[PDB]
């Protein structure tokens, strides 16, 4: 109708999802396929003579700029709508967008990909390809933030479908954030995912079995769809049919739509990063790194790796491997320190495995580098040993972490490097520890276990290696300093006097080996 012509001719304000869907097809229609004559002929009817009709038709479409403008405005609207939710919190199902918005966004990105690809393919010829970088000066940040939002959305969709409480839900989120197996760089991921008993294997496998082959292929719009007049319209129709087909499912309907939209978004990001003259590393690297390492994104991580390898490193020797290792250490510290409680859905084996892995990488020099940089920037070796004070956990975890200290100091002594010296100086912050937690922690080992317990041997070896690590600290070459020793003596004397007084002196005969060496 003429009202549509005037509503979108000189401007396109107050549009909606249905308006966007109709407008994309209409605008693509009146370009090359000779519907323009049909439109003006019908405009002759209903009372518009040809002079107005031709002028409005000419000034309604002028081409790529129109597409990027409208889709940028749609992206801005979607980002503004989703910006009301931020930080890192688990989102409910009800705040996930409805199917209409999802396939509207999918159609928008598909049209943008097709138009940009044809524009750059025709720009492959000629001698002036630089006149196309200024139109994508704003697409990239919006695309990255939208990708981050949708990754959060699919992560929340997987999480909330696992009545489990919120605390172990956050624990499961921490476990799965460093999961995934499609990347060969990490090793813990599959093991930590698989050792959980029943919840995150059947559900995770059922959700990972949602294949998206019913959708059109990567470049199917170039070969199987270029025969017709407007290949973009056929591609949009196929995508819409694929999205509509998912409604019949009863187990996990939105999974296929979310997977496909994330895949298309990351592919468009890669194509844009190829075509964009302006390229700014840190945002794209931090918004693409979690994709490879996320268990909730495994059907997409390969494209992310492909796009990141060509720009940030050959994936074996460059700094990308060190960045991946740094992400692994960050995740390991997070899970070890924050969710040590046994009610966070955590089995002791998960902490055991991650501790073993991070020792194994601590042995290697190249990983030990990033190890020390991360514990110097934001990490803290002391949190791991504070985690032992939790009375809700067995003594095997304490044994493993204490053996961890034994081995890092052994590697410090045998093969001294500046990273090991710096981490030796790192534990000097034991003075900053408030007295109550350190008193409780010392009470954890210093208390004699019941003689009917199976951990008597474990605690005996713990006492032995505690004396050994004490000798390690009190060494002159050690960088911890005498203040830590003085405060340790001050907070070891009183309850020593106490359990000599009220108690029978159990566990006393091997105490002197500790604070006597402290005095040394």
SS3 of 270-291: the string is HHHHHHCCCCCHHHHHHHHHHH
Contact 85, 91 (CB under 8 A): yes
- Closest by CA to 271, choosing from 299, 303, 296, is 303
Question: Which pairs count as long-range contacts for 462-466, CB under 8 Å and 24+ apart, including other chains?
Answer: 462/395, 462/398, 462/399, 462/402, 463/507, 463/510, 465/402, 465/403, 465/406, 466/402, 466/514
Do 324 and 185 form a contact (C-beta atoms < 8 A)?
yes
Does residue 297 sit in helix, strand or coil? coil
Helices and strands (H, E) in the chain, number of each type: 26, 0
Three-state DSSP class for 71?
helix
Place of tokens 């597409």: 67
Q: What is the per-residue burial (b if ≥16 Cβ within 10 Å, else e) of 393-422?
A: bebebbbbbbbbbbebbebbeeeeeebbee
* Alpha-carbon gap, residue 259 to 298, rounded angstroms: 9
Query: What would the 3-class secondary structure string for 164-187 be?
Result: CCHHHHHHHHHHHHCCCCCCCCCC
CA 232/CA 223 separation, integer angstroms: 12
The contacts of residue 200 (CB under 8 Å, 6+ apart) are: 162, 172, 175, 176, 193
DSSP string of 199-254, one letter each residue: HHHHHHHHHHT---TTS--SSHHHHTSSSSS-HHHHHHHHHHHHHHHGGG-SS-TH
Tell me which method was used to determine the 3D structure: cryo-EM
Task: Say how far residue 509 (Cα) sits from the centre of its chain.
Answer: 51
Burial of 436 (0-12, 13-18, 19+ CB in 10 A): exposed
- The structure tokens listed for 9 are 């001719």
* Phi, psi dihedral angles at 446 (to 5 degrees): -65, -25
Q: How many CB atoms lie within 10 A of CB 122?
A: 9
- How many residues are listed for the chain in this entry? 520
Contact assessment for residue 146 and residue 75, using Cβ atoms and an 8 Å cutoff: yes
The Cα–Cα gap between 88 and 177 comes to 12
- Measured torsion, CA atoms of residues 273, 275, 276, 277, in degrees rounded to the nearest 10: 130
Q: 193 is written with which tokens?
A: 């995912």
Whole-angstrom Cα distance, residue 33 to residue 237?
17
Please give the structure tokens belonging to residue 218. 């990567």
Angle between helices 17-29 and 64-82 (to 10 degrees): 170
Residue 94 C-beta-side C-alpha neighbours within 13 Å: 0
**Please, are residues 209 and 76 in contact by the beta-carbon 8 Å criterion?**
no
Tokens of residue 288, six digits: 């693409």
Query: Any residues with CB less than 8 A from the CB of 297 and at least 6 apart, and which?
Result: 151, 154, 155, 180, 262, 290, 291
Q: Are 362 and 368 in contact (CB under 8 A)?
A: yes
CA distances (Å), 334 to each of 113, 135, 338, in order? 38, 41, 6
What is the Cα 335 distance to its own chain's centre?
14
Q: What is the resolution of this structure in A?
A: 3.1
The residue whose two tokens read 């869907």 is 21
Q: Specify whether the CB–CB gap between 79 and 149 falls below 8 A.
A: yes
- The C-alpha atoms of residue 307 and residue 60 are separated, in whole angstroms, by 37
Q: Which two tokens stand for residue 376?
A: 């110097």
From the list 399, 405, 410, the residue with the least C-alpha distance to 427 is: 405
- Report residue 278 as tokens: 């302006």
User: Measured between alpha carbons, how far is 382 from 384 in angstroms, rounded to an integer?
Assistant: 5
The Cα 166–Cα 334 span in angstroms is: 17
Distance from C-alpha of 259 to C-alpha of 265, rounded to nearest angstrom: 10
Comparing CA positions, the residue from 310, 353, 300 lying closest to residue 182 is 300
- In whole angstroms, what is the distance from residue 298 CA to residue 171 CA? 20
CA distances, 106 to each of 101, 246, 259, 261, 265 (Å): 8, 14, 11, 6, 8
Q: Strands of 245-364 (E only): list them.
A: none
Strand segments, DSSP code E, in 205-265 are: none
Q: Who contacts 510 (Cβ-Cβ below 8 Å, separation ≥6)?
A: 463, 467
Distance of alpha carbon 473 from the chain centroid: 38
Residue 16, classed as helix, strand or coil, is: coil
Give CA–CA dist 359/366, Å, rounded: 13
Exposed, middle or buried, 102 (CB in 10 Å: 0-12/13-18/19+)? Answer: buried
Token couple for 515: 């604070």
Distance CA 271, CA 263 (A): 12
396 neighbors 458 (Cβ within 8 angstroms) = yes
b/e string for 75-97 if b means 16 or more Cβ within 10 A? beebeeebeeeeeeeeeeeeebb
Residue 136 to residues 64, 69, 266, 504: CA-CA distances in angstroms? 11, 10, 16, 78
Nearest to 465 by CA among 398, 370, 393, 366: 398
Would you state the torsion angle of the CA atoms of residues 245, 259, 170, 177, taken in this order, to the nearest 10 degrees? 160
d(CA 17, CA 20) in angstroms, rounded, equals 5
Whether the Cβ atoms of residue 515 and residue 489 lie closer than 8 Å to each other = yes
The pair of three-digit structure tokens given for residue 340, joined into one six-digit string: 């040590």
- Angstrom distance (rounded) from CA 480 to CA 428: 5
Question: In angstroms, rounded to a whole number, what is the distance separating the alpha carbons of residues 347 and 195?
Answer: 8
Owner of token pair 């020793």: 485
- Alpha-carbon distance of 359 to 294, in angstroms, equals 23
Share in percent of the chain as helix, strand, coil (round to 5): 70, 0, 30
> Helices 166-177 and 199-208: crossing angle, nearest 10°?
60
Q: How far is CA 435 from CA 99, 410, 443, 483, 490, in A?
A: 55, 28, 12, 14, 10
- Pick the closest to residue 104 from 261, 322, 289 (CA basis): 261
């Amino acid at each position: 109708s003429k009202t549509y012509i005037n509503q979108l001719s000189m401007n396109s304000p107050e549009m909606s999802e249905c308006d966007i869907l109709h407008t994309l097809r209409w605008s693509s229609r009146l370009r090359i396929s000779s519907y323009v004559n049909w439109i003006k002929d019908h405009l002759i009817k209903q009372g518009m003579k040809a002079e107005h009709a031709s002028s409005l038709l000419e000034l309604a479409s002028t081409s790529v700029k129109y597409d990027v403008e409208i889709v940028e405005e749609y992206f801005a609207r979607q980002i503004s709508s989703f910006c009301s939710i931020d930080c890192t919190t688990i989102l409910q199902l009800h705040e996930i967008p409805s199917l209409q918005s999802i396939y509207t966004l999918d159609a928008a990105i598909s049209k943008v990909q097709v138009s940009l690809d044809e524009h750059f393919s025709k720009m492959a010829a000629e001698t002036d390809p630089h006149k196309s970088s200024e139109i994508t000066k704003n697409l990239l940040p919006a695309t990255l933030q939208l990708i981050d939002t949708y990754a959060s959305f699919t992560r929340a969709y997987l999480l909330q479908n696992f009545k489990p409480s919120k605390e172990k839900l956050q624990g499961f989120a921490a476990v799965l954030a460093i999961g995934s197996s499609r990347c060969k760089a990490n090793t813990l991921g599959p093991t930590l995912v698989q050792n959980l008993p029943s919840s995150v294997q059947t559900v995770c496998e059922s959700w990972n079995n949602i294949n998206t082959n019913e959708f059109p292929n990567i470049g199917s719009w170039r070969n199987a769809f270029a025969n017709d007049t407007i290949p973009s319209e056929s591609y949009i129709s196929a995508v819409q049919a694929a999205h509509l087909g998912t409604l019949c499912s009863q187990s996990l309907p939105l999974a296929a739509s979310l997977k496909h939209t994330l895949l298309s978004l990351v592919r468009l990001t890669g194509d844009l990063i190829v075509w964009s003259d302006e390229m700014n590393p840190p945002q794209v690297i931090r918004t693409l790194l979690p994709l490879l390492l996320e268990s909730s994104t495994e059907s997409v991580a390969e494209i992310s790796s492909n796009s990141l390898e060509r720009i940030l490193g050959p994936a074996e020797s460059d700094e990308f491997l060190a960045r991946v290792y740094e992400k692994l250490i960050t995740g390991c510290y997070n899970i070890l320190a924050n969710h040590a409680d046994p009610n966070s859905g955590l089995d002791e084996s998960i902490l055991e495995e991650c501790l073993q892995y991070l020792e194994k990488q601590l042995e290697s020099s190249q990983a030990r580098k990033a190890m020390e940089e991360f514990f110097s920037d934001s990490g803290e070796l002391v949190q791991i040993m504070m985690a032992t004070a939790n009375e809700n956990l067995s003594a095997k975890f304490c044994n493993r972490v204490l053996k961890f200290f034994t081995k890092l100091f052994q590697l410090t002594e045998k093969s001294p490097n500046p990273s090991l010296l710096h981490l030796c100086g790192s534990l000097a912050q034991l003075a900053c520890v408030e007295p109550v937690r350190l008193q409780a922690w010392l009470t954890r080992m210093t208390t004699s276990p019941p003689k009917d317990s199976d951990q008597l041997d474990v605690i005996q070896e713990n006492r032995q290696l505690l004396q050994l690590l004490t000798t390690y600290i009190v060494r002159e070459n050690s960088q911890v300093g005498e203040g830590v020793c003085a405060v340790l003596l001050g907070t070891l004397t009183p309850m020593a006097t106490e359990m000599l007084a009220n108690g029978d002196g159990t566990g006393f005969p091997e105490l002197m080996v500790v604070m006597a060496t402290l005095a040394s």
